[PDB]
Amino acid sequence: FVNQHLCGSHLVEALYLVCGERGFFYTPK
């Protein structure tokens, strides 16, 4: 799933930034 992998890579970097001290969860398909 190359597109989904590239998307998730950028999603985690954005969540890290947006969520700050709250942290976040990444749950792929």
Residues in contact with Zn ion, counted by CB under 5 A, come to a total of 1
Distance CA 20, CA 6 (A): 22
Segment 1 to 29, residues that bind Cl ion, using CB under 5 A: 6
Which residue is closest to Zn ion by CB?
6
5 binds, among Cl ion, ligand Cc1cccc(O)c1, Zn ion, none (CB under 5 to 8 A by kind): ligand Cc1cccc(O)c1
| Residue 17 contacts other proteins per CB under 8 A | yes
Give the contacts of 4 (CB within 8 A, at least 6 positions apart).
28, 29
Residue with tokens 């969860």: 25
